[model samples]
Target: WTDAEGYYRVNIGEVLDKRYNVYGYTGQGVFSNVVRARDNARANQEVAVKIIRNNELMQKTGLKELEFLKKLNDADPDDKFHCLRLFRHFYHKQHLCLVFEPLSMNLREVLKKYGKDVGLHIKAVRSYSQQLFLALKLLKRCNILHADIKPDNILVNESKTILKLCDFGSASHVADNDITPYLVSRFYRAPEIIIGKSYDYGIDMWSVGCTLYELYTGKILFPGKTNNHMLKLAMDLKGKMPNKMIRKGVFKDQHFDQNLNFMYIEVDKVTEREKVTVMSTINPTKDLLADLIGCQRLPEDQRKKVHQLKDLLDQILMLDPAKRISINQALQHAFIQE
Candidate 1:
């Protein structure tokens, strides 16, 4: 069944391509719907089949995902990199279907199941961060930009020990300069993207910072309601955007005035209406991780690990994308090294 929104309505006990039998729905993305299916030809092994929406735009995106996955998977035959593997692809009733190794649940679900709104244990956060760094390294090696990197894009094995980065719908070949601000999900979006600065792999690193923060705190680090508010939250967390960088942004005028002072919209508490105001001063950046984790009162060893993580986050959350940590630097950082 096909829905009006273009999502394929998956039904249990349905067979596709005559070789796979669908048993359960796994997940859904803008471009496709995923189903758990048994590969009848391969010892009846279970796999995830992503059925792309039957439409012009989504079909093109589906093809791009296929191309990007082929390049990524081919470069890592040993599969040490924490990237989801594409097992096969075929067509089903005009829908482009991609078969992949099955995964149990995404990190979002993991947080919901186990985080208890206090976030995952520090040890689990470290393990997943290490694996994600490895995945980022692979993307850098191939010169591909996985523009969208968030908790929902990361999946875990049934044991919940192994993590793999998935969802290449927004991925593209690394371009030194791109103009898309809507590239990543709003909360995880990088400052460079928000301010209309030329962006590359550093955007992904920014996303990692956001994702890791949420994993440890069980709260969205930036929780902005709109683009303007998002900028305020970013400045609040990372301090002010550099004046030089602001002058260079193509869309700077939208947020800054002729004198280069930043302006944003906020709702007046009494009137409940929008008001544009200039930010005369933004508070200095704080020790965010310390503030978040200190109150938890973790054991001594875990506290030390949290310190290392704080340092790593400091490197990752730089407002200037050029100064943000690279995959290699992050992987070798004390937090991941330990």
Candidate 2:
């Protein structure tokens, strides 16, 4: 309807901002709608046109993202960083429109269409991880934080080999570390974030760990329904949060009680039952990192690869963000190198 809320109703074959001919609809996210369009002046080349929702808040967010995008693009003029390139942008009606190079599909779609019971091939995960690490390296160098890091935000090429990091809407400067407890997607959120601590690039590495796990296992590493549940799931794998770390959380009281014990009430959505547990009593569902890998059923060679991946994942998913692997070290890690 293109009414007060400000989403432009895209019509097929409609030319937007005079140059992009909208031919197909890509999809919509929380803040905007995307359409597959052709560049009328560039030999009919295809591109993705993102239409920012026509709202004051979203428009403001769009401007900040534009600044980050310009920074990222200028730094990687050769386009070697694996960050999505913004071709150009303009204002159509009251909407901010961004033109981007086209990507085939996101990793989530790839997982849904081709992931086996154990998820994608180990080689594919390794390949994608390397590129993601590269992108992370650039983000760190630029001092930007990709607050939202998830499978849906990573796009793959037609061959499903090359990958690019996209979606900077949730991104913020590294200096602007103060954020809500609910920062990233629940499944890939870092423990530090769940406890409401100031975060840095380490949060992104934690997300990379969760993402790679799902790519290799066809399952979410931490499928929590809520923030408390997310922290509970994290503790199950990495053990309890350090009291030193907990004490620093701005929102500690929400998830932890006196004596520094994690205690939160959550009613099961399906069972409609209430439950809460002292963090100490909760045991590791998979005691060892190897067990969490769960690659026993795989062939010996594949198991070896998964084991290597486990070591990298272990360091990445550390409970303390300070202990998490850095982007450069991760890129040079044995698993990534292979």
Candidate 3:
């Protein structure tokens, strides 16, 4: 519900039912608009408020997310919890609003500020990755699936030195046949979803690998332009897909060959008139299992820690979802164990 100038759902300085005074706009999400607001009753206290358009479709998603957030809060209602928090929620002017603790920025913004040459410190990556693994543990206990796990959905409290997972709009219960394929961003999507197979908590672990790679190297591990492209990139780096699973989905004929190699045009079909058939081939840029993947810019001294950390990331980036490492394994790995 944008205004004439397409100013999202709200403008700066607008008051939300005489409670939250919009101080500034922070981030805009798919179906919700986020803004920083001051709590009128609390002295110098501020929060991030999300305003969702009140409709059957939007309301269903908004309410589902609220349920997940409330459940998370009930389970771990403490300051030390690693997952994101929900302060309160309300409805006003045909909008269902949710209030949360104000965080400085997300990992995407942080990556933009510091490119690959000077990415986040490895120590910080270990800490953040440890917390995310623990956060998955919490989600597991509640039988929840944080379907959309990516850099942007994870928030950072700069002063508190804390990282929390947010954006439960795509979260769901562990029940099967209940999720859509497009819930997560392509960059962080799991192989199961890409191949039209059933997924569970393991999908989040795949995203963790992608997120860890991005944080350490400051670039997307499998930066695919399309679903096929993404699959080819994953196969090219990790290994080929399992032929047994390849034949399980109807979409298989379109993406894979009888030999199980991915199919794509040499020149981008979108930008070129003539197309060339290309198969998924091993295009080695660096040692994904060792050599710190793409963090070649790091000084010779820092390479040791990054290499050890890369070993841990390998377990999570397995091609088959069944073979991918779980959060349990992640918590015990040397990178976070130390």
Candidate 4:
């Protein structure tokens, strides 16, 4: 164990020393407690320390995280900017200490502080989006799926918007035939996963689209309380699953019956009378993009579609995972350029 003065001393079958004081407690999840601690040995540099409690589940999770991080580091040693640098680790009693690089507030914190109005800053949003997409692309290349990708997981830094992409506790390697349970936050979860279908990296791509939509609209794209509710929401907005998808055995074990009534319908039919109300409820700035593209000034027939952020995001959030754009393709999209 390390002591308070950054000196190593022998204690309880190990070395002990206090390197730095705890800055603040970041969070406490099921497996560990995250704290912002300083590294006394390195001029008191700030770092995140995850203290894994003495428990069978926590120990297993910590071990898995360590293994995944080590693999990621080995695969991308030359590209240090992509991930949160793991610093050190120590074991005291049953406690496991995992340290990491200090990062600025996450996307959730920034959104809470600035509100949805921050989306108006196209340059900043685009820059952040590009960085996150780059990180996702790199991870995908390694056959890893960040099952949980949301605003809370993205961490920013002084130089660039860093997508920390932490909490691999639920992440897993891509496989040819694997059927896993739902493993992501409800609001940002992909359509295929919603109905109990097997999934892959495309699930992460769906989440990215949902995150971008939330950033722009200041509201979640799908705020369903249950799987059925989520399906209803998706069906009402993105249209029904095509017949081909149904025939392909998707949603085979879903709770909803095979009846077409329970399936999704076209958005135009679902929101015919409540178009404006629905649009206003989700995206307050729906007209903002239209206005920016000079579409609001022109008649409906002569108006242009605002294919800036929304159009690009729509492609990524496709109901069919196979049709969704990859992270690499998203980086090259025109919306990022704008």
Candidate 5:
């Protein structure tokens, strides 16, 4: 009974489901605690278990993720993209236990380990981005929207040859109107989600671009201190926002003026009389992202890949979800197709 100060928690060396032996506690997320577990039923098989709190919404989210993985595994048993692997799930001591195949480490931990001196090369970024694109495509095919896509949720394999997108707590289908737009991580959240608009899978693409940039530079692209702060940064980058889109935001009047420029009141005192500035003009994608990634030295082909990758990211980061590239269109883009 090592449950912590929260509604639930799991201790090290605890066993659940009579077979999966929990040897270590890896992480504590907003919705669950992740642990390293080994199945006694199998021969030295390792896995990560997401122990979710026993509540309605909590259990529902886990089930939704389980549903997404089930559909994915059903579609491709071999798991071509290495998206997410589910072994099984059950209730353990008032907690919903979800067992998943163990992945080496998430991108965030990897960055922290080997970041400052030598960040992931542009070549590696291109390859990982391509795989992430495929992973997003799989979610789209399954009619699911992964509301969260930050570096912490993206797992990399031991060899760095492959990646696995984990943490589907925010995953949902397109028609899940009840899911709030405020689900993504602040740094990588899309503009539409920030403003509480009717969002779709495009939000995930926005995060994908943000995650890739952070990998190359070892920093967040739009590291706003708050949601409105980041939204202002986004407005600055996109230059102008459609009045209609602004009108659709649930929290529009709270942060926007009649002129559509972002306005911050007393509580949000960052920008009193300032404007957010997007560094690139239209099609500046080719030049803008390359400079941000700051990979001035690389092979010609890799450089070309970086340019194309930026072009693709440029489309994904648009303030308008309508204008943002769809996962399908992104997959067909020059960056991924190559």
Candidate 6:
């Protein structure tokens, strides 16, 4: 059983031989693998079977994923429009098998295929944004913050336009009054997490901003090569953090003063070489920043911001973590309005 990566792999036919036909591997990740299987009795209906490594299954992160799926399943067993449907989970030879509805492709793959062209389709973007926002609202109602909300975590169905938010491995429950920093992926992480400030569901809003930018430009907005570089880039783009904000317990004894400055200097060097333009080519109709905030010519219209789709994103991407908008407020924004 175990492969070179120390993870186990079993054929679908072997597990339920004669009941289903093996369709081969679908995807693989750090701690798990997914395979496609077809049921012979259901006109060859396809399903995805994920196998989580035994060691990872025991980790807190993996356990969180399990609990997330279980909770969602219990809440709405028939709700499969914006979420992945989990069918079954069982242990087989030290590995955990998780069966789920088979999805066609992910947003990352779609972006790679279509590139910048995808942004031209406003309808597609608006529809997907609505669905994702709805998913976020649902997760928030359950007190779950999906720490990782990137293109790679979004799956599409046969329609290729129906988006389903997947992967809760990085999800965490927010306590009523607790605020502590926890790191997610470097590129999509929030400013609060970058400055070592305690965060809440607003972290997901930041990720939504990053994802929207990527979808708009067909490229990663903040592609930091390293964690340090990522943090510095965020600061340079968003502006320097306030001393009081940085003095939080999370930043104590972290040597951030020197490191922070060095990161800024490094970012300057990289930008010089790449000649990268920030938010310029976002959309031709309006200025990048203005368009991001969903504002037109009128200042009042700008202040009357409606959806978190754009305005909430504007705040989430703020350099000062303290000024970022909360997820609950973002849910009420105009950009998400249908």
Better-scoring candidate (TM-score), 4 or 6: 4
lDDT-better candidate, 3 vs 6:
3
Candidate 4's residue-wise lDDT over 66-157, tens digit each? 87777677777875436556676777555777888787567776777766533324555666678778767767877888788887777767
| Candidate 5 residue-wise lDDT, 35-109, digit = tens | 888898898589888878656787788888887778877876778865878888888777788787787588988
Instruction: Please give the lDDT score for candidate 3.
Output: 0.78
Q: What lDDT, from 0 to 1, does candidate 1 have?
A: 0.87
What is the TM-score ranking, best to worst? 1, 2, 3, 5, 4, 6
RMSD of each: 1.6, 2.4, 3.0, 8.1, 4.1, 6.7
* lDDT (CA) per prediction: 0.87, 0.85, 0.78, 0.64, 0.75, 0.64
Clashing pairs in 5: 236-276, 237-278
List candidate 6 stretches off by more than 4 Å: 9-20, 40-44, 54-63, 78-81, 116-120, 176-182, 252-312, 320-322, 326-332
lDDT of 6 by residue, 1-338 (tens): 87766576665455443454666767778878777887676787787777786685444455567788877667765674377777766666767767778885788888887755333244465577667766776777778778888998988887776787888887767774334344668788766775567777677767877887677546676788655556555655555555566676364333254333322324355355522222211121323354443233435443343233455456667755557765555555565553
Q: Which stretches of candidate 3 lie over 4 Å from their true place?
A: 1-11, 54-56, 178-181, 259-261, 268-271, 274-286, 289-301
Task: Quote the RMSD, in angstroms, for model 3.
Answer: 3.0
Which prediction has more favorable TM-score, 1 or 4? 1
Flag regions of model 4 displaced more than 4 Å.
Answer: 1-17, 116-120, 158-160, 176-178, 249-256, 263-306
lDDT for position 8 in model 5: 54
What is candidate 3's lDDT per residue for 64-84, written digit by digit as tens? 999999998899967455787
Per residue, candidate 2 scores C-alpha lDDT tens digits across 1-338 of 37566788889989987889888887877789899988999998989988999899998998888888999999999998899999988998888988999775888888888845457888888889999998998999899989888999998877887899888988988986766887888788888887888789898889888999888877888889888888888888777888899999888898888888889677967898988866655566744445446545677777777878988988898889988888888888888776
- Candidate 1: worst 10 consecutive residues by lDDT? 285-294
Question: Worst 10-residue stretch by lDDT in candidate 3?
Answer: 286-295
How do the residues 204-255 of candidate 1 rate in per-residue lDDT, one tens digit apiece? 8889889998888877888888777888888887777899888878888888
Return the lDDT, model 2, position 208. 89
Q: What clash pairs does model 4 have?
A: 1-15, 1-16, 1-17, 2-16, 2-17, 2-18, 3-16, 3-17, 3-18, 4-18
* TM-score list, all predictions: 0.95, 0.92, 0.87, 0.77, 0.83, 0.75
